[PDB]
Paper text:
We found that while Rv1045 encodes the guanylyltransferase TglT (unusual type guanylyltransferase-like toxin), which arrests bacterial growth, Rv1044 encodes the atypical protein kinase TakA (unusual type of atypical kinase antitoxin), which neutralizes the activity of TglT via phosphorylation. It encompasses an N-terminal domain (NTD) and a C-terminal domain (CTD). The NTD (1-181aa) exhibits an α/β fold that commonly found in nucleotidyltransferase-like proteins. A large central cavity is formed between NTD and CTD.
To shed lights on the origin of TglT phosphorylation, we determined the crystal structures of a selection of mutants, S78A, D82A and E146Q. On the contrary, while no electron density was observed for S78 phosphorylation in the crystal structure of TglT mutant E146Q expressed alone, we observed clear electron density for a phosphate group connected with residue S78 side chain in the TglT mutant E146Q structure co-expressed with TakA, resembling the structure of the wildtype TglT. Surprisingly, mutant E146Q (motif 2a) exhibited toxicity similar to the wildtype protein. We next compared the initial growth rates of E146Q, D82A and wildtype TglT, which revealed a clear difference 4 hours after induction. While the growth rate of D82A exhibited negligible differences from the plasmid control, the growth rate of E146Q was significantly lower. Thus, E146Q mutation on motif 2a led to attenuated toxicity rather than complete loss of function. The E146Q mutant exhibited toxicity similar to the wildtype TglT, which was rescued by TakA.
Residue numbers in the entry: 3 to 292
């Protein structure tokens, strides 16, 4: 019943995925995106400095999915990361890793392009991983890489997933991730940011993720989070800490979209209530002292 040998080919891989997905009550494409992200994460985890410490830390929706599992996280499409080396090093090192492969998977990477960002001195980079399994195209993963901000690569959490185990690929999964205080600081900054009026802030989904991150801090001391929030807001030199969690007129349905699949969790059910919850979190962070 549990596969004793790895999938012999793509078709066998897809067949085992659909079985696992049906078995777990998960959408096939969701499980497939998760497995592909994991494979890319394993490539990224081979990138170390000359002391063996990670060069790339995972963040964003991939991190939340690793922290909470598929049933308890938003569907997201990006593999978002933070690097401690230049993009040119990162892209070249990833391409090598993807050529060497991992457990039958290989990847080729499109070229990095810069993206518009006002608070980062170094512009983020974005490209794509074309994944294959035993020679045959398998999946596409959008990748984003941003440079360090303040202390947000000083430490990392190491998370895992058994999804590849469940389809007969047993090699341990271990993914270095940006820690929760920095995920909170960056999402709080993004969800409260005011953009230039050609552009509009659509990040209502960050209100969902911020509730999930507050839940994951449990009763932790908030002081590291407060320090991280201060550091990110001062570093970006835009709106000041503590921000106001405002809602824009088009956010009600975006927030509703972001709740898809999470009916079983205790989340704010309306964007107003979500803004109120995250504002209370902001105040709670700001109160921290010891
Ligand atoms: Mg096949
Ligand atoms: Mg299914
Ligand atoms: Mg390092
Ligand atoms: Mg994800
Ligand atoms: Mg992903
Ligand atoms: Mg710092
Ligand atoms: Mg193992
Ligand atoms: Mg705003
Ligand atoms: Mg609504
Ligand atoms: Mg969403
Ligand atoms: Mg729901
Ligand atoms: Mg609820
Ligand atoms: Mg409130």
């Amino acid at each position: 019943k549990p596969y004793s040998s790895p999938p012999t080919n793509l078709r066998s891989l897809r067949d085992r995925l659909t079985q696992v997905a049906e078995r777990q009550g998960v959408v096939f494409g969701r499980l497939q995106r998760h497995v592909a992200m994991i494979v890319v994460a394993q490539f990224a985890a081979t990138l170390t400095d000359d002391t063996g410490a990670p060069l790339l830390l995972v963040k964003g929706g991939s991190s939340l999915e690793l922290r909470r599992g598929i049933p308890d996280s938003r569907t997201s499409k990006d593999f978002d990361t933070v690097a401690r080396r230049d993009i040119e090093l990162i892209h070249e090192q990833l391409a090598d890793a993807g050529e060497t492969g991992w457990e039958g998977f290989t990847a080729i990477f499109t070229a990095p392009e810069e993206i518009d960002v006002p608070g980062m001195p170094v512009k983020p980079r974005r490209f794509t991983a074309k994944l294959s399994y035993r020679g045959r195209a398998f999946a596409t993963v959008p990748i984003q890489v941003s440079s360090v901000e303040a202390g947000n690569a000083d430490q990392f959490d190491t998370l895992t997933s058994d999804a590849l185990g469940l389809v007969g690929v047993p090699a341990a999964v271990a993914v270095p991730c940006m820690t929760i205080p920095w995920q909170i600081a960056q999402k709080l900054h993004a969800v409260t940011a005011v953009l230039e009026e050609p552009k509009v802030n659509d990040r209502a989904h960050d209100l969902v993720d911020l509730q999930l991150l507050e839940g994951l801090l449990l009763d932790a001391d908030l002081m590291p989070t407060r320090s991280a929030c201060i550091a990110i807001f001062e570093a970006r030199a835009q709106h000041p800490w503590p921000p106001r969690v405002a809602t824009l007129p088009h956010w009600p349905l975006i927030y509703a979209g972001a709740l898809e699949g999470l009916d079983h969790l205790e989340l704010a059910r309306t964007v107003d209530a979500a803004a109120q919850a995250v504002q209370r979190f902001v105040a709670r962070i700001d109160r921290a002292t010891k």
